[PDB]
Protein backbone atom coordinates (compact mmCIF):
# COMPACT_ATOMS: atom_id res chain seq x y z
CA UNK A 1 0.00 0.00 0.00
CA UNK A 2 2.33 2.71 1.29
CA UNK A 3 5.35 0.67 0.28
CA UNK A 4 7.80 0.34 -2.60
CA UNK A 5 9.43 3.74 -2.17
CA UNK A 6 11.55 4.21 0.93
CA UNK A 7 10.61 7.88 0.87
CA UNK A 8 6.82 7.77 1.19
CA UNK A 9 5.31 8.36 4.62
CA UNK A 10 2.42 6.23 5.80
CA UNK A 11 -0.52 8.36 6.99
CA UNK A 12 0.53 7.31 10.51
CA UNK A 13 4.13 8.46 10.10
CA UNK A 14 5.53 4.99 9.44
CA UNK A 15 8.28 4.16 6.96
CA UNK A 16 7.15 0.67 6.04
CA UNK A 17 10.19 -0.30 3.99
CA UNK A 18 12.64 0.27 6.83
CA UNK A 19 10.37 -1.72 9.14
CA UNK A 20 10.36 -4.54 6.61
CA UNK A 21 14.14 -4.50 6.66
CA UNK A 22 14.18 -4.57 10.46
CA UNK A 23 11.85 -7.57 10.49
CA UNK A 24 13.72 -9.38 7.73
CA UNK A 25 16.88 -9.16 9.81
CA UNK A 26 15.30 -12.07 11.68
CA UNK A 27 16.24 -14.48 8.89
CA UNK A 28 19.87 -14.37 9.97
CA UNK A 29 22.23 -16.50 11.98
CA UNK A 30 22.26 -16.00 15.71
CA UNK A 31 24.88 -13.57 16.99
CA UNK A 32 25.47 -12.12 20.43
CA UNK A 33 27.98 -10.32 22.60
CA UNK A 34 28.72 -9.79 26.28
CA UNK A 35 30.57 -6.93 27.94
CA UNK A 36 32.35 -8.85 30.70
CA UNK A 37 34.53 -6.14 32.24
CA UNK A 38 38.26 -6.85 31.87
CA UNK A 39 37.36 -8.11 28.39
CA UNK A 40 34.55 -8.56 25.91
CA UNK A 41 33.25 -11.54 23.96
CA UNK A 42 31.39 -12.13 20.71
CA UNK A 43 29.83 -15.38 19.54
CA UNK A 44 27.77 -16.52 16.59
CA UNK A 45 26.10 -19.60 15.13
CA UNK A 46 27.75 -20.90 11.96
CA UNK A 47 24.53 -21.97 10.29
CA UNK A 48 24.37 -23.59 6.85
CA UNK A 49 26.93 -26.30 7.59
CA UNK A 50 27.44 -28.89 4.86
CA UNK A 51 29.95 -31.69 4.47
CA UNK A 52 31.30 -30.45 1.13
CA UNK A 53 31.90 -26.82 2.09
CA UNK A 54 35.58 -26.18 2.76
CA UNK A 55 35.72 -23.24 5.19
CA UNK A 56 39.23 -22.05 4.39
CA UNK A 57 38.53 -18.55 5.67
CA UNK A 58 39.35 -17.13 9.10
CA UNK A 59 35.87 -16.81 10.61
CA UNK A 60 32.87 -15.73 8.54
CA UNK A 61 30.67 -13.64 10.86
CA UNK A 62 33.56 -11.97 12.73
CA UNK A 63 35.73 -9.20 11.29
CA UNK A 64 38.64 -7.07 12.45
CA UNK A 65 37.53 -3.54 11.64
CA UNK A 66 40.70 -2.19 13.20
CA UNK A 67 43.69 -3.00 15.38
CA UNK A 68 41.47 -2.19 18.40
CA UNK A 69 37.90 -3.18 17.41
CA UNK A 70 35.86 -5.98 15.91
CA UNK A 71 32.34 -6.49 14.66
CA UNK A 72 29.84 -9.16 13.70
CA UNK A 73 27.09 -8.94 11.12
CA UNK A 74 23.67 -10.36 10.29
CA UNK A 75 21.68 -9.85 7.11
CA UNK A 76 22.32 -9.74 3.39
CA UNK A 77 25.81 -10.94 2.55
CA UNK A 78 26.59 -8.34 -0.12
CA UNK A 79 25.60 -5.50 2.19
CA UNK A 80 27.70 -7.10 4.91
CA UNK A 81 30.80 -6.99 2.74
CA UNK A 82 30.06 -3.43 1.62
CA UNK A 83 29.64 -2.17 5.17
CA UNK A 84 32.71 -3.99 6.51
CA UNK A 85 34.86 -2.45 3.79
CA UNK A 86 33.41 0.98 4.50
CA UNK A 87 34.11 0.62 8.22
CA UNK A 88 37.73 -0.29 7.61
CA UNK A 89 38.07 2.71 5.32
CA UNK A 90 36.57 5.03 7.93
CA UNK A 91 38.87 3.79 10.67
CA UNK A 92 41.97 4.20 8.53
CA UNK A 93 40.91 7.67 7.39
CA UNK A 94 40.55 8.82 10.97
CA UNK A 95 43.87 7.27 11.94
CA UNK A 96 45.60 9.08 9.10
CA UNK A 97 44.02 12.43 9.89
CA UNK A 98 44.59 12.43 13.66
CA UNK A 99 47.29 9.77 14.09
CA UNK A 100 45.26 8.05 16.81
CA UNK A 101 42.83 5.12 16.87
CA UNK A 102 39.19 5.88 16.13
CA UNK A 103 37.00 5.78 19.25
CA UNK A 104 34.32 3.14 18.89
CA UNK A 105 31.33 5.45 19.15
CA UNK A 106 32.60 7.66 16.33
CA UNK A 107 32.98 4.74 13.94
CA UNK A 108 29.54 3.44 14.86
CA UNK A 109 27.91 6.81 14.33
CA UNK A 110 29.63 7.32 10.99
CA UNK A 111 28.40 4.02 9.60
CA UNK A 112 24.95 4.63 11.06
CA UNK A 113 24.83 8.00 9.32
CA UNK A 114 25.55 6.23 6.04
CA UNK A 115 22.67 3.87 6.72
CA UNK A 116 20.31 6.72 7.53
CA UNK A 117 21.31 8.50 4.34
CA UNK A 118 20.37 5.39 2.40
CA UNK A 119 17.00 5.37 4.13
CA UNK A 120 16.62 9.07 3.30
CA UNK A 121 16.76 9.09 -0.52
CA UNK A 122 14.43 7.40 -2.97
CA UNK A 123 17.03 6.05 -5.37
CA UNK A 124 18.13 3.15 -3.19
CA UNK A 125 16.73 0.61 -0.73
CA UNK A 126 17.71 0.54 2.95
CA UNK A 127 20.58 -1.63 4.05
CA UNK A 128 19.23 -4.92 5.33
CA UNK A 129 22.04 -5.54 7.79
CA UNK A 130 22.41 -5.20 11.55
CA UNK A 131 25.62 -5.67 13.48
CA UNK A 132 27.47 -5.58 16.78
CA UNK A 133 30.73 -3.82 17.57
CA UNK A 134 33.10 -4.62 20.43
CA UNK A 135 36.14 -2.52 21.18
CA UNK A 136 38.32 -0.69 23.65
CA UNK A 137 39.54 2.88 23.83
CA UNK A 138 41.09 5.21 26.37
CA UNK A 139 37.98 7.36 26.63
CA UNK A 140 35.53 4.73 27.89
CA UNK A 141 37.42 1.49 28.46
CA UNK A 142 35.61 -1.43 26.89
CA UNK A 143 32.43 -0.94 24.92
CA UNK A 144 29.80 -2.92 23.06
CA UNK A 145 27.39 -1.35 20.59
CA UNK A 146 24.57 -2.50 18.35
CA UNK A 147 23.46 -0.96 15.06
CA UNK A 148 20.26 -1.66 13.16
CA UNK A 149 19.01 -1.20 9.57
CA UNK A 150 17.01 1.92 10.41
CA UNK A 151 20.24 3.73 11.28
CA UNK A 152 19.78 3.93 15.08
CA UNK A 153 22.39 2.49 17.44
CA UNK A 154 22.83 1.81 21.12
CA UNK A 155 25.24 0.55 23.74
CA UNK A 156 24.65 -2.54 25.85
CA UNK A 157 26.29 -4.78 28.40
CA UNK A 158 25.03 -7.87 26.57
CA UNK A 159 22.75 -8.50 23.61
CA UNK A 160 21.84 -10.83 20.74
CA UNK A 161 20.57 -9.68 17.35
CA UNK A 162 19.64 -12.46 14.95
CA UNK A 163 17.22 -15.38 14.82
CA UNK A 164 15.76 -16.15 18.28
CA UNK A 165 17.00 -12.92 19.81
CA UNK A 166 13.95 -12.66 22.07
CA UNK A 167 14.71 -15.79 24.06
CA UNK A 168 18.42 -14.97 24.21
CA UNK A 169 17.81 -11.49 25.61
CA UNK A 170 15.26 -12.81 28.09
CA UNK A 171 17.77 -15.31 29.44
CA UNK A 172 20.56 -12.76 29.53
CA UNK A 173 18.50 -10.19 31.40
CA UNK A 174 17.45 -12.87 33.86
CA UNK A 175 20.98 -14.24 34.32
CA UNK A 176 23.55 -11.52 33.62
CA UNK A 177 25.25 -9.77 36.53
CA UNK A 178 26.54 -6.20 36.45
CA UNK A 179 30.26 -5.62 36.95
CA UNK A 180 31.11 -9.17 37.99
CA UNK A 181 31.43 -11.33 34.86
CA UNK A 182 35.24 -11.44 34.61
CA UNK A 183 35.05 -13.03 31.16
CA UNK A 184 35.13 -16.71 32.10
CA UNK A 185 31.65 -16.47 33.56
CA UNK A 186 30.79 -14.55 30.41
CA UNK A 187 31.99 -17.44 28.25
CA UNK A 188 29.94 -19.91 30.27
CA UNK A 189 26.83 -17.74 30.03
CA UNK A 190 27.26 -17.29 26.29
CA UNK A 191 27.61 -21.03 25.76
CA UNK A 192 24.48 -21.66 27.81
CA UNK A 193 22.53 -19.08 25.82
CA UNK A 194 23.66 -20.56 22.52
CA UNK A 195 22.79 -24.07 23.68
CA UNK A 196 19.26 -23.09 24.62
CA UNK A 197 18.51 -20.88 21.62
CA UNK A 198 20.20 -22.97 18.93
CA UNK A 199 18.08 -25.78 17.51
CA UNK A 200 20.89 -28.32 17.18
CA UNK A 201 21.69 -30.37 20.28
CA UNK A 202 25.08 -30.99 21.90
CA UNK A 203 26.35 -27.73 20.37
CA UNK A 204 28.83 -29.24 17.96
CA UNK A 205 31.97 -27.14 18.15
CA UNK A 206 31.74 -26.48 14.42
CA UNK A 207 28.34 -24.86 14.89
CA UNK A 208 29.54 -21.93 17.01
CA UNK A 209 32.31 -19.37 16.56
CA UNK A 210 33.76 -17.24 19.35
CA UNK A 211 36.08 -14.24 19.52
CA UNK A 212 37.35 -12.30 22.51
CA UNK A 213 38.95 -8.87 22.88
CA UNK A 214 41.08 -8.05 25.91
CA UNK A 215 43.98 -5.82 26.93
CA UNK A 216 47.52 -6.84 27.78
CA UNK A 217 50.66 -4.75 28.30
CA UNK A 218 48.84 -1.72 26.95
CA UNK A 219 47.93 -3.38 23.64
CA UNK A 220 44.63 -4.90 22.58
CA UNK A 221 44.42 -8.58 21.69
CA UNK A 222 41.52 -9.79 19.54
CA UNK A 223 41.81 -13.61 19.30
CA UNK A 224 39.21 -16.07 17.86
CA UNK A 225 39.07 -19.28 19.87
CA UNK A 226 40.18 -22.38 17.99
CA UNK A 227 38.42 -25.74 18.03
CA UNK A 228 40.16 -27.08 21.13
CA UNK A 229 39.13 -24.21 23.40
CA UNK A 230 35.51 -24.36 22.28
CA UNK A 231 35.55 -28.12 22.79
CA UNK A 232 36.81 -27.69 26.34
CA UNK A 233 34.24 -24.99 27.06
CA UNK A 234 31.30 -27.00 25.75
CA UNK A 235 32.55 -30.08 27.59
CA UNK A 236 32.63 -28.07 30.81
CA UNK A 237 29.10 -26.80 30.20
CA UNK A 238 27.80 -30.31 29.56
CA UNK A 239 29.51 -31.58 32.69
CA UNK A 240 27.92 -28.80 34.73
CA UNK A 241 24.51 -29.63 33.28
CA UNK A 242 25.01 -33.25 34.31
CA UNK A 243 26.11 -32.12 37.77
CA UNK A 244 22.90 -30.13 38.20
CA UNK A 245 21.00 -33.36 37.55
CA UNK A 246 19.45 -35.10 40.58
CA UNK A 247 20.08 -31.97 42.68
Amino acid sequence: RYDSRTTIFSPEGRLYQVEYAMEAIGHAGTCLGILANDGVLLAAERRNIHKLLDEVFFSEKIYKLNEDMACSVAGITSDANVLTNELRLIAQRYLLQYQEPIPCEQLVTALCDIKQAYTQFGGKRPFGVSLLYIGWDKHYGFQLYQSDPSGNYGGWKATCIGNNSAAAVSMLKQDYKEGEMTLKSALALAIKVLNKTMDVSKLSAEKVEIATLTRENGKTVIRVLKQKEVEQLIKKHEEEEAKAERE
Binding site: H27, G29, R47, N48, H50, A74, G75, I76, T77
Partner: protein
Protein backbone atom coordinates in the same frame (compact mmCIF):
# COMPACT_ATOMS: atom_id res chain seq x y z
CA UNK B 1 -3.22 -31.69 27.51
CA UNK B 2 -5.11 -31.94 30.79
CA UNK B 3 -5.08 -28.16 31.28
CA UNK B 4 -7.04 -27.56 28.08
CA UNK B 5 -9.58 -30.22 29.04
CA UNK B 6 -10.05 -28.66 32.46
CA UNK B 7 -10.53 -25.20 30.99
CA UNK B 8 -13.06 -26.33 28.39
CA UNK B 9 -14.95 -28.31 31.03
CA UNK B 10 -15.05 -25.26 33.29
CA UNK B 11 -16.42 -23.03 30.56
CA UNK B 12 -18.93 -25.52 29.11
CA UNK B 13 -20.22 -27.96 31.72
CA UNK B 14 -20.25 -25.70 34.77
CA UNK B 15 -22.60 -22.96 33.47
CA UNK B 16 -25.08 -25.47 32.05
CA UNK B 17 -25.07 -27.62 35.20
CA UNK B 18 -24.31 -25.20 38.06
CA UNK B 19 -25.97 -21.85 37.33
CA UNK B 20 -26.28 -21.33 41.08
CA UNK B 21 -22.52 -21.00 41.52
CA UNK B 22 -22.30 -18.20 38.97
CA UNK B 23 -25.43 -16.37 40.09
CA UNK B 24 -24.14 -16.42 43.66
CA UNK B 25 -20.79 -15.17 42.39
CA UNK B 26 -22.63 -12.38 40.61
CA UNK B 27 -20.73 -12.65 37.31
CA UNK B 28 -22.30 -13.48 33.96
CA UNK B 29 -21.35 -16.97 32.85
CA UNK B 30 -19.05 -17.35 29.82
CA UNK B 31 -20.40 -18.23 26.39
CA UNK B 32 -17.62 -18.47 23.79
CA UNK B 33 -14.62 -20.77 23.52
CA UNK B 34 -11.96 -20.77 20.80
CA UNK B 35 -9.53 -23.57 19.95
CA UNK B 36 -6.53 -22.53 17.86
CA UNK B 37 -3.65 -24.95 17.41
CA UNK B 38 -0.96 -23.99 14.90
CA UNK B 39 -0.67 -27.61 13.76
CA UNK B 40 -4.26 -28.33 14.74
CA UNK B 41 -3.37 -31.45 16.72
CA UNK B 42 -6.16 -32.81 18.90
CA UNK B 43 -8.41 -29.76 18.29
CA UNK B 44 -11.90 -31.13 17.45
CA UNK B 45 -10.91 -34.67 18.63
CA UNK B 46 -11.34 -32.81 21.87
CA UNK B 47 -14.47 -31.65 20.06
CA UNK B 48 -15.73 -35.20 19.59
CA UNK B 49 -14.76 -36.03 23.17
CA UNK B 50 -16.86 -33.23 24.63
CA UNK B 51 -19.59 -34.24 22.20
CA UNK B 52 -19.67 -37.74 23.68
CA UNK B 53 -20.35 -36.51 27.22
CA UNK B 54 -22.49 -33.66 25.94
CA UNK B 55 -25.65 -34.41 27.94
CA UNK B 56 -27.16 -31.66 25.75
CA UNK B 57 -28.18 -31.20 22.14
CA UNK B 58 -24.84 -31.17 20.31
CA UNK B 59 -25.15 -29.32 17.01
CA UNK B 60 -22.33 -29.21 14.48
CA UNK B 61 -21.59 -27.50 11.16
CA UNK B 62 -18.35 -28.37 9.35
CA UNK B 63 -19.03 -28.46 5.60
CA UNK B 64 -17.49 -25.13 4.63
CA UNK B 65 -20.78 -23.37 5.28
CA UNK B 66 -23.48 -25.76 3.93
CA UNK B 67 -25.58 -24.21 1.13
CA UNK B 68 -23.98 -20.76 1.24
CA UNK B 69 -23.99 -20.58 -2.53
CA UNK B 70 -25.94 -19.05 -5.40
CA UNK B 71 -29.20 -17.43 -4.31
CA UNK B 72 -32.03 -19.21 -2.52
CA UNK B 73 -31.37 -17.97 0.99
CA UNK B 74 -28.91 -15.29 2.08
CA UNK B 75 -27.26 -16.29 5.36
CA UNK B 76 -29.24 -19.48 5.93
CA UNK B 77 -26.64 -20.67 8.47
CA UNK B 78 -28.32 -18.46 11.04
CA UNK B 79 -31.64 -17.33 12.46
CA UNK B 80 -33.25 -20.67 11.67
CA UNK B 81 -30.24 -22.60 12.98
CA UNK B 82 -30.08 -20.69 16.24
CA UNK B 83 -33.82 -20.78 16.86
CA UNK B 84 -33.60 -24.54 16.35
CA UNK B 85 -30.71 -24.81 18.80
CA UNK B 86 -32.48 -22.66 21.39
CA UNK B 87 -35.55 -24.86 20.94
CA UNK B 88 -33.50 -27.65 22.51
CA UNK B 89 -32.84 -25.48 25.54
CA UNK B 90 -29.43 -26.90 26.54
CA UNK B 91 -27.19 -27.27 23.50
CA UNK B 92 -23.78 -26.46 22.04
CA UNK B 93 -22.79 -25.84 18.42
CA UNK B 94 -19.58 -26.68 16.57
CA UNK B 95 -18.02 -24.57 13.80
CA UNK B 96 -15.12 -26.70 12.61
CA UNK B 97 -14.12 -24.24 9.88
CA UNK B 98 -13.82 -20.86 11.64
CA UNK B 99 -11.66 -19.77 8.71
CA UNK B 100 -14.46 -19.34 6.20
CA UNK B 101 -17.48 -17.17 7.09
CA UNK B 102 -15.35 -14.24 8.19
CA UNK B 103 -11.78 -12.99 7.99
CA UNK B 104 -12.16 -9.22 7.41
CA UNK B 105 -17.30 -9.80 -0.28
CA UNK B 106 -20.88 -11.05 -0.22
CA UNK B 107 -19.93 -13.95 2.06
CA UNK B 108 -19.24 -11.70 5.05
CA UNK B 109 -22.91 -10.68 5.19
CA UNK B 110 -23.68 -14.00 6.85
CA UNK B 111 -20.74 -13.53 9.22
CA UNK B 112 -22.12 -10.16 10.30
CA UNK B 113 -25.54 -11.70 10.82
CA UNK B 114 -23.97 -14.44 12.92
CA UNK B 115 -22.04 -11.93 15.01
CA UNK B 116 -25.19 -9.93 15.68
CA UNK B 117 -27.19 -13.05 16.51
CA UNK B 118 -24.55 -14.36 18.91
CA UNK B 119 -24.11 -10.92 20.49
CA UNK B 120 -26.66 -9.43 22.84
CA UNK B 121 -29.60 -7.15 22.05
CA UNK B 122 -32.46 -9.56 22.81
CA UNK B 123 -30.18 -12.62 22.69
CA UNK B 124 -30.87 -15.36 25.22
CA UNK B 125 -28.49 -17.77 26.98
CA UNK B 126 -28.05 -21.49 27.78
CA UNK B 127 -26.25 -21.90 24.43
CA UNK B 128 -22.52 -22.38 24.04
CA UNK B 129 -20.16 -22.33 21.08
CA UNK B 130 -16.74 -23.81 20.38
CA UNK B 131 -14.71 -22.81 17.32
CA UNK B 132 -11.83 -24.76 15.79
CA UNK B 133 -9.31 -23.30 13.35
CA UNK B 134 -5.65 -22.42 12.85
CA UNK B 135 -4.00 -18.99 12.82
CA UNK B 136 -6.79 -17.17 14.64
CA UNK B 137 -5.17 -13.81 13.86
CA UNK B 138 -6.68 -13.80 10.37
CA UNK B 139 -10.08 -14.15 12.02
CA UNK B 140 -12.07 -10.94 12.20
CA UNK B 141 -11.59 -8.86 15.34
CA UNK B 142 -15.33 -8.68 15.99
CA UNK B 143 -15.44 -12.45 16.41
CA UNK B 144 -12.44 -12.09 18.73
CA UNK B 145 -14.15 -9.57 21.00
CA UNK B 146 -14.35 -10.94 24.56
CA UNK B 147 -18.13 -10.65 24.53
CA UNK B 148 -18.70 -13.04 21.57
CA UNK B 149 -15.70 -15.26 22.43
CA UNK B 150 -14.55 -15.57 26.04
CA UNK B 151 -11.81 -18.20 26.40
CA UNK B 152 -8.99 -18.75 23.92
CA UNK B 153 -7.04 -22.01 24.05
CA UNK B 154 -3.92 -22.93 22.10
CA UNK B 155 -2.84 -26.51 21.49
CA UNK B 156 0.96 -26.40 21.46
CA UNK B 157 2.86 -29.38 20.04
CA UNK B 158 3.22 -32.09 22.69
CA UNK B 159 6.50 -32.27 24.58
CA UNK B 160 8.45 -35.46 25.20
CA UNK B 161 6.15 -36.43 28.07
CA UNK B 162 2.97 -35.65 26.14
CA UNK B 163 4.35 -37.45 23.10
CA UNK B 164 5.03 -40.52 25.23
CA UNK B 165 1.55 -40.37 26.72
CA UNK B 166 -0.19 -40.14 23.36
CA UNK B 167 2.02 -42.92 22.01
CA UNK B 168 1.02 -45.15 24.90
CA UNK B 169 -2.62 -44.24 24.27
CA UNK B 170 -2.45 -45.24 20.61
CA UNK B 171 -0.28 -48.31 21.32
CA UNK B 172 -2.66 -50.05 23.74
CA UNK B 173 -3.75 -52.59 21.12
CA UNK B 174 -0.25 -52.98 19.65
CA UNK B 175 1.40 -56.29 20.51
CA UNK B 176 4.63 -54.60 21.50
CA UNK B 177 7.29 -57.11 22.48
CA UNK B 178 9.51 -57.03 25.55
CA UNK B 179 12.47 -54.79 24.83
CA UNK B 180 10.95 -51.78 23.10
CA UNK B 181 11.61 -48.44 24.80
CA UNK B 182 8.84 -45.90 24.21
CA UNK B 183 10.95 -43.37 26.11
CA UNK B 184 13.59 -43.48 23.38
CA UNK B 185 11.00 -43.15 20.62
CA UNK B 186 9.50 -40.09 22.29
CA UNK B 187 12.99 -38.66 22.72
CA UNK B 188 14.12 -39.00 19.10
CA UNK B 189 10.90 -37.51 17.67
CA UNK B 190 10.84 -33.90 18.89
CA UNK B 191 8.36 -31.44 17.46
CA UNK B 192 5.60 -34.03 17.21
CA UNK B 193 2.20 -33.10 15.81
CA UNK B 194 0.22 -35.54 17.95
CA UNK B 195 -1.31 -37.19 14.91
CA UNK B 196 2.26 -38.01 13.90
CA UNK B 197 2.43 -40.43 16.84
CA UNK B 198 -0.57 -42.36 15.55
CA UNK B 199 0.97 -42.24 12.10
CA UNK B 200 4.27 -43.73 13.22
CA UNK B 201 2.35 -46.43 15.08
CA UNK B 202 0.26 -47.31 12.03
CA UNK B 203 3.24 -47.40 9.69
CA UNK B 204 5.14 -49.60 12.14
CA UNK B 205 2.17 -51.94 12.10
CA UNK B 206 2.31 -51.99 8.32
CA UNK B 207 6.02 -52.80 8.43
CA UNK B 208 5.27 -55.72 10.73
CA UNK B 209 2.52 -56.86 8.38
CA UNK B 210 4.80 -56.89 5.34
CA UNK B 211 7.09 -59.41 7.02
CA UNK B 212 3.91 -61.30 8.01
CA UNK B 213 4.61 -61.12 11.75
CA UNK B 214 2.42 -60.22 14.82
CA UNK B 215 5.28 -58.44 16.74
CA UNK B 216 6.75 -54.84 16.50
CA UNK B 217 10.42 -54.14 17.48
CA UNK B 218 12.48 -51.13 18.47
CA UNK B 219 14.08 -51.35 15.03
CA UNK B 220 10.65 -51.26 13.40
CA UNK B 221 9.65 -48.18 15.38
CA UNK B 222 12.92 -46.46 14.50
CA UNK B 223 12.30 -47.14 10.82
CA UNK B 224 8.81 -45.78 11.46
CA UNK B 225 10.16 -42.54 12.91
CA UNK B 226 12.49 -42.18 9.94
CA UNK B 227 9.65 -42.74 7.48
CA UNK B 228 7.26 -40.28 9.13
CA UNK B 229 9.63 -37.31 9.08
CA UNK B 230 10.36 -35.54 5.78
CA UNK B 231 13.26 -33.15 5.18
CA UNK B 232 13.88 -30.52 2.51
CA UNK B 233 17.06 -28.79 1.36
CA UNK B 234 18.35 -26.71 -1.53
CA UNK B 235 21.70 -24.98 -1.95
CA UNK B 236 22.83 -21.49 -3.05
CA UNK B 237 19.83 -19.89 -1.33
CA UNK B 238 21.93 -20.18 1.84
CA UNK B 239 22.68 -16.47 2.05
CA UNK B 240 21.84 -13.93 4.77
Amino acid sequence: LDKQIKEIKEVIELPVKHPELFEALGIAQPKGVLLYGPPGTGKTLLARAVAHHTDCTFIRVSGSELVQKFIGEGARMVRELFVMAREHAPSIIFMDEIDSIGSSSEVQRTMLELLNQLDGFEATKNIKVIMATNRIDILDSALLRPGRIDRKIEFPPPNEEARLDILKIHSRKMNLTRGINLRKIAELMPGASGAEVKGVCTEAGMYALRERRVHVTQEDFEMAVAKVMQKDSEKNMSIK
